[PDB]
Amino acid sequence: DKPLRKISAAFKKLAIIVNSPNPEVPVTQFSHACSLVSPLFGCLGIAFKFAEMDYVAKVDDLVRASSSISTLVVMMDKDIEADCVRKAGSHTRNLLRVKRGLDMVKVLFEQIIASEGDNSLKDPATKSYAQVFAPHHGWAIRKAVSLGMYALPTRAHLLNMLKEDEAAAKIHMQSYVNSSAPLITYLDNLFLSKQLGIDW
Numbered sequence: 510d511k512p513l514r515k516i517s518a519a520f521k522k523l524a525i526i527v528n529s530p531n532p533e534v535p536v537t538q539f540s541h542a543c544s545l546v547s548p549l550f551g552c553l554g555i556a557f558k559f560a561e562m563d564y565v566a567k568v569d570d571l572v573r574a575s576s577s578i579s580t581l582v583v584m585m586d587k588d589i590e591a592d593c594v595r596k597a598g599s600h601t602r603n604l605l606r607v608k609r610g611l612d613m614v615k616v617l618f619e620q621i622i623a624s625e626g627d628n629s630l631k632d633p634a635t636k637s638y639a640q641v642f643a644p645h646h647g648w649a650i651r652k653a654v655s656l657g658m659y660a661l662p663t664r665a666h667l668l669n670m671l672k673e674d675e676a677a678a679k680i681h682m683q684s685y686v687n688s689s690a691p692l693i694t695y696l697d698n699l700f701l702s703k704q705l706g707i708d709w
């Protein structure tokens with residue numbers, strides 16, 4: 510029905526949790542919310558094919574795994590205990606990848622809002638990619654992304670795909686931006702407070 514509204518509702522709930530006394534983020538709830546974001550990358554077209562493995566598959570890995578994990582803290586603590594944080598396919602490694610996707614969407618939305626009046630998505634898509642993902646991508650991937658930018662949908666077409674007009678889309682995009690920001694900071698802090706780094 511209204512995919513942007515399902516996204517804003519899910520992330521509002523996560524923001525409430527992270528801002529609540531003694532916050533506990535359930536892995537099932539978190540992974541499900543992240544899955545609502547997955548189809549946005551496909552909407553943007555071939556420039557963002559990388560996100561299929563870099564984000565969507567990683568979300569799906571966490572959803573699958575979530576049946577046996579309670580909270581993000583517990584999940585990460587078990588990886589620290591086993592000393593497998595940076596191992597391929599670890600819950601915590603996949604979490605870091607998912608966090609980056611949420612952040613790219615946050616910047617994408619911020620930039621769409623900031624460029625209101627522009628009919629193109631090229632600058633918002635380019636700026637969000639270059640800030641969030643380019644630093645983690647090899648040159649050949651970066652080149653491929655730049656070539657796919659011509660195939661972005663028009664801004665109007667994206668809103669059509671999301672079943673919203675400009676006014677409503679602005680409201681729900683801004684909502685996602687407001688909710689995701691504290692969540693992303695909460696996630697970064699899980700890593701930084703345990704000296705794990707976030708740039709790997």
Ligand code: NA
Nearest residue numbers: 537575576578
């Ligand atoms: Na669970």
